[PDB]
Design a binder for this molecule. Structure first.
Ligand SMILES: Cc1cn([C@H]2C[C@H](OP(=O)(O)O)[C@@H](COP(=O)(O)O)O2)c(=O)[nH]c1=O
Ligand SMILES: [Ca+2]
Length: 130
């Protein structure tokens, strides 16, 4: 299975990207399997605020790389982020602030968990699915 690794928050960027101090060096982390609207787009500020509150108020920050590629073409770390035990990726999808997207076979461990959260967000007509 995968493993959670500790890290510390430098600053929240937007809905699906956060700057973290990972093993002594700053790194921008892009959330796996999700896509939040840009800050300039509808639900973008809400998505940003959500992720921002989760990571800033969190005592325990953890990153969890999947079984494949760890960085993308933009130099961003690819992982699942946890704030006090709760997965940020999943929480965003459950609230309808992020759509399940960029699902690559190499990094798809929590795919079902997230698609289940998205289907429920859809049923409740939340935010992007309203
Ligand atoms: C989430 C994720 C995104 N990406 C790339 C796909 C997209 O590239 P292209 O834009 O070149 O298509 C980009 C989407 O990022 P953003 O949603 O931050 O724009 O990041 C990965 O390569 N792997 C991943 O796991
Ligand atoms: Ca995005």
């Amino acid at each position: 299975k995968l493993h959670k690794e500790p890290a510390t928050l430098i600053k929240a960027i937007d809905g699906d990207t956060v700057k973290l101090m990972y093993k002594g060096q700053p790194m921008t982390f892009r959330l796996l399997l999700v896509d939040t609207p840009e800050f300039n787009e509808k639900y973008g500020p809400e998505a940003s605020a959500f992720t921002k509150a989760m990571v800033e108020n969190a005592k325990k920050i953890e990153v969890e790389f999947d079984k494949g590629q760890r960085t993308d073409k933009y130099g961003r770390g690819l992982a699942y982020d946890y704030a006090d035990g709760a997965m940020v990726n999943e929480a965003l999808v459950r609230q309808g602030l992020a759509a399940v997207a960029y699902v690559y076979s190499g990094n798809n461990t929590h795919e079902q968990l997230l698609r289940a959260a998205e289907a429920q967000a859809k049923k409740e007509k939340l935010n992007i699915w309203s």
